[PDB]
Amino acid sequence: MSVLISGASGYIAKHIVRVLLEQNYKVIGTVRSQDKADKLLKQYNNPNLSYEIVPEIANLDAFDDIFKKHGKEIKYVIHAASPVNFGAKDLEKDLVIPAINGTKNMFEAIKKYAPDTVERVVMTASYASIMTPHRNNDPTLTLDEETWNPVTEENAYENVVTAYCASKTFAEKEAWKFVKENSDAVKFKLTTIHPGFVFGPQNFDEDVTKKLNGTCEIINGLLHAPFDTKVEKTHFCQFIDVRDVAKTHVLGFQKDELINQRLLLCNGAFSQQDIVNVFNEDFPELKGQFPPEDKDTDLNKGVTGCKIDNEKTKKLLAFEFTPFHKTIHDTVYQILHKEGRV
């Protein structure tokens, strides 16, 4: 009945492991080093948790050793490992290759060592594999769970943004191709999850560092910006709360109606200024210690960019998503409280 989760040291994955342990699952995470495994075991202090070391998901047959050891006990797989940080001049090596190869490696290990034992795979894709980046600001485009990012391998590396979005798109395409080509050989059913920009508190307070890795540094950077910093008030993207994402991953292998589904996890548009506005409304005593409030944002003028049709996703998951204001508030409170400022 064990659950394997790849990339278990990350921002989203630490919340997923929390949820799994809340529900009494035995959990095997993969992390890059013994260092990280040791630190995590001390943070969770839970005997149902263990880690295996996978230093590089891109390398040959990277997940085989896990299934040679645990193949008989792994019933569910959450494939969450894909690069979010990467060298801007190593867009294949650091980004597209590990995204794709990590996915192929996970699925091929299941096929080779546990084709009839693994029942469900839940893969973290992205809003990036559904949306068209250059139409982020186009309200005449409506996206739903069947829409695909049309980026080509030829044009994928326009910039770091298109390249990351292509890494998610190409990896997810390979995932569905595998499931189509192996429906007779392997038992597992695939569910993919497609978060927008993920915000919300770190799973552990102690992991709030001066500079955050990943998407929450958007918030943390604005929170510490000098008062006179120029803040953009134009549409940035869609967001989703990390705790909604984590809850969805676990439902993803539990609920029969999520089999073969792409789940579009966005809950609203924002600009940098909409984030800053929460600072000023919710922590008025600190006004002046970060950039000021300005209600003139795209969002407040009814400008939210390409449209999100995720009614099917919301109906299947059934639970209400966390509103933007709370997600930002909880992120900011955790930082300011850790700093002793509130």
Ligand SMILES: NC(=O)c1ccc[n+]([C@@H]2O[C@H](COP(=O)([O-])OP(=O)(O)OC[C@H]3O[C@@H](n4cnc5c(N)ncnc54)[C@H](OP(=O)(O)O)[C@@H]3O)[C@@H](O)[C@H]2O)c1
């Ligand atoms: N807004 C978001 O944050 C967002 C939105 C949509 C989808 N996602 C997807 O959610 C998943 C986790 O993202 P995150 O935001 O939680 O970022 P994160 O904190 O950087 O987590 C990424 C995890 O994957 C590991 N990883 C990445 N590349 C690896 C590689 N080549 N080999 C071995 N391990 C590797 C990382 O380990 P190390 O840190 O040790 O390298 C880490 O454990 C990813 O699949 C991401 O594409 C994120």
